[PDB]
Amino acid sequence: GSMEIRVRVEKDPELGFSISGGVGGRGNPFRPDDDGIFVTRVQPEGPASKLLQPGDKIIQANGYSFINIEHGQAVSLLKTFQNTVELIIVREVSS
């Protein structure tokens, strides 16, 4: 099933996770036919540890929609934010 979750990540000065995807992007390893932005890796001692996991789909960040966002715009937005970023993610959950 899926779960929508609000996550606060404090930049120090990075978020400590990697992403793939976006409109115009080269995809992702989770939902390959989906244009979304997905968390691909979370630094184990970084600011997102215990909060984000690979597979999490970013659908909003600091109130900006990440639904069907272009890849470069998504990257640049996440990099432009300062201090805390409030994410909305969609996480798949085991049956």
């Binding site: 990075e14 978020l15 996770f17 990697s18 793939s20 080269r26 995809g27 390893p29 990257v75 996440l78």
Partner: peptide, 9 residues
């Protein structure tokens, strides 16, 4: 196809 290139932020 996706080939594993992700972007750290």
């Amino acid at each position: 196809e996706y080939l594993g290139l992700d972007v750290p932020v």
